[PDB]
Amino acid sequence: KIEEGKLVIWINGDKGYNGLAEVGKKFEKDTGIKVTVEHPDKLEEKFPQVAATGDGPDIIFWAHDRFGGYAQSGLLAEITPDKAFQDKLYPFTWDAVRYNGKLIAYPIAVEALSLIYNKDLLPNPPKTWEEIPALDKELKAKGKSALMFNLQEPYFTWPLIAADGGYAFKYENGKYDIKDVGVDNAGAKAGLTFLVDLIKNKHMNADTDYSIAEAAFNKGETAMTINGPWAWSNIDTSKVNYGVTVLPTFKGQPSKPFVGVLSAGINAASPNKELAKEFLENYLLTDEGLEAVNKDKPLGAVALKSYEEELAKDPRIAATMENAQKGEIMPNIPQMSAFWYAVRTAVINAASGRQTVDEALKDAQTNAAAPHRTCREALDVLAKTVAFLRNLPSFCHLPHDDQRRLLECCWGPLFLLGLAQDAVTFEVAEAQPSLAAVQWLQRCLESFWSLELGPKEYAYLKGTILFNPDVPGLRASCHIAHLQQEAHWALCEVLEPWYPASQGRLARILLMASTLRNIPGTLLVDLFFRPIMGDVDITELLEDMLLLR
Amino acid sequence: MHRVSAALEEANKVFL
Numbered sequence: 001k002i003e004e005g006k007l008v009i010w011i012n013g014d015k016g017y018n019g020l021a022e023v024g025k026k027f028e029k030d031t032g033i034k035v036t037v038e039h040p041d042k043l044e045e046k047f048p049q050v051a052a053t054g055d056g057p058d059i060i061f062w063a064h065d066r067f068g069g070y071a072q073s074g075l076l077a078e079i080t081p082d083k084a085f086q087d088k089l090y091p092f093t094w095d096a097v098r099y100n101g102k103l104i105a106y107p108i109a110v111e112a113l114s115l116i117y118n119k120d121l122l123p124n125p126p127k128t129w130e131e132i133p134a135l136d137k138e139l140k141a142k143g144k145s146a147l148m149f150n151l152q153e154p155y156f157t158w159p160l161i162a163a164d165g166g167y168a169f170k171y172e173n174g175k176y177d178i179k180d181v182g183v184d185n186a187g188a189k190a191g192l193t194f195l196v197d198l199i200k201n202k203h204m205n206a207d208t209d210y211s212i213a214e215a216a217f218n219k220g221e222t223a224m225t226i227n228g229p230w231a232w233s234n235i236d237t238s239k240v241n242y243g244v245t246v247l248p249t250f251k252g253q254p255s256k257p258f259v260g261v262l263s264a265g266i267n268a269a270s271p272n273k274e275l276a277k278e279f280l281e282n283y284l285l286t287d288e289g290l291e292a293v294n295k296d297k298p299l300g301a302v303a304l305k306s307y308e309e310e311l312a313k314d315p316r317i318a319a320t321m322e323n324a325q326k327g328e329i330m331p332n333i334p335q336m337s338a339f340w341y342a343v344r345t346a347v348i349n350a351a352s353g354r355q356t357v358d359e360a361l362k363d364a365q366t367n368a369a370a371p372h373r374t375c376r377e378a379l380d381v382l383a384k385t386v387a388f389l390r391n392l393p394s395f396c397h398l399p400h401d402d403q404r405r406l407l408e409c410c411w412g413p414l415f416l417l418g419l420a421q422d423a424v425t426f427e428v429a430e431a432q433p434s435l436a437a438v439q440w441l442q443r444c445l446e447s448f449w450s451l452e453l454g455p456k457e458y459a460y461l462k463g464t465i466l467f468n469p470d471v472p473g474l475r476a477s478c479h480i481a482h483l484q485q486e487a488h489w490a491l492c493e494v495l496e497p498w499y500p501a502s503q504g505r506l507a508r509i510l511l512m513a514s515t516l517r518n519i520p521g522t523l524l525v526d527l528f529f530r531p532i533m534g535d536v537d538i539t540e541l542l543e544d545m546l547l548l549r
Numbered sequence: 550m551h552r553v554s555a556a557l558e559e560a561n562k563v564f565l
């Protein structure tokens with residue numbers, strides 16, 4: 001349960017975990033305390049998962065922007081660095097780790113996204129984004145690209161989005177306005193609109209991720225790329241003469257990259273708080289310490305004044321700083337999680353074409369500024385759905401095995417059809433279901449709200465969905481089939497007064513109902529119930545309300 | 550086994 005006498009450390013996979021491991025070996029040889037450095041995936045969300053239960057690592061490394069939330073949740077311990085030690089680090093990096101007036105982590109280094117270009121290919125990197133498309137046009141003539149960076153993380157595309165006017169939370173009087181979100185204003189829209197047009201014009205792929213971008217650049221397939229200090233290490237070992245410089249300017253204005261401060265926090269549930277402090281203060285946060293780490297993968301501008309002055313001569317670090325000035329420090333408030341997820345969803349939906357720029361930034365702006373009013377409405381619909389089945393003798397008189405069987409694969413469509421008729425727009429704020437699925441869910445749902453069905457149509461349709469003869473191992477299969485046919489005949493008579501239009505309505509409603517049946521029951525739980533009642537077994541819960549279990 | 554229509558309309562009233 002977080003073992004005593006040992007020290008487990010978690011750090012992102014793109015950092016110099018090997019260099020850190022070495023500092024751990026030196027630490028282990030001196031104190032006799034084992035130190036294991038792990039780098040799990042989705043660490044950003046995996047830490048809080050276990051941290052709450054009481055387990056997890058003793059020390060956690062990540063940008064300050066997340067620590068604020070972990071603090072509120074009570075997953076971190078307030079560090080106790082004596083005055084003397086504080087003076088060794090820049091007072092500028094101490095604010096990044098200060099939440100509600102308490103230091104919640106040790107500052108390690110300041111990182112900022114910069115433009116990395118291949119000198120041999122581009123002796124002169126572009127000054128503006130606008131001039132990139134044309135630059136890609138000819139580079140292609142030689143089987144090469146112009147720009148290639150990760151599009152799966154809004155962190156990389158933010159500089160462009162905020163360039164014109166986009167921003168997370170308005171800042172005034174040393175305070176953040178959790179209600180003022182600028183992710184769907186004129187500025188943000190233009191920026192993301194440019195990014196999309198780059199994909200549409202085949203100047204960039206939508207599925208491009210971190211790995212793809214890195215490989216493509218280190219192999220000389222792309223002329224430029226956007227990354228942080230940690231990425232300079234792998235480029236060196238590759239035959240590429242790169243150069244780190246200021247990011248392109250969009251619409252005359254500079255790109256404002258979010259500045260982050262790599263920080264180390266101590267788990268509030270660890271019995272090695274002292275062993276931790278000792279390690280982060282007398283080993284890692286030292287000239288030799290940060291050098292070992294930096295040696296593996298660059299840390300940018302280290303918080304340790306002494307070691308910072310040595311690397312200050314590095315032209316690459318200077319570029320990172322130039323870019324950092326143009327940008328702004330990341331907020332560390334609890335809502336930052338909701339923000340990032342909302343933005344991540346918008347950028348990916350727009351790049352993949354599942355949504356338009358306006359549609360994407362529309363939902364993000366609403367989700368970024370998060371009520372579980374959605375879930376509470378799903379619960380009402382579910383209960384409603386139970387009352388609907390308790391009535392309707394046709395279903396109550398069916399064999400119990402059939403009742404449980406029809407329920408096992410119909411509660412989904414039945415429930416969704418309930419949300420529709422109950423007129424409840426949803427705000428999926430999941431601060432892991434696939435975006436494609438979620439997007440498909442709402443499209444179908446909005447399809448019902450625009451078709452404007454009546455009370456009869458809904459009722460007869462529900463019958464068509466409930467009594468499904470195709471359900472494997474069904475006893476009263478023939479009778480159920482006769483029941484579905486009746487509902488289908490009724491659904492038609494309610495649409496019979498026609499001359500022209502009602503004809504395309506039956507096919508429309510029908511196909512729409514079919515898309516409902518193709519929605520993962522698992523997805524429904526994670527989107528409407530889990531967030532309010534933890535893990536849940538709908539089939540089980542429903543058989544209880546209907547006394548079938 | 551018939552007139553399931555009238556039944557459905559009545560049973561789904563809870564959603565009005």
Ligand SMILES: OC[C@H]1O[C@H](O[C@H]2[C@H](O)[C@@H](O)[C@@H](O)O[C@@H]2CO)[C@H](O)[C@@H](O)[C@@H]1O
Nearest residue numbers: 012014063065066111153154155260340
């Ligand atoms: O993409 C959203 C993500 O951005 C930041 O994460 C960065 C991290 O700070 C960098 O040091 C490096 O690891 O790349 C990450 C993005 O891939 C935020 O710190 C993070 O909370 C946010 O979700």
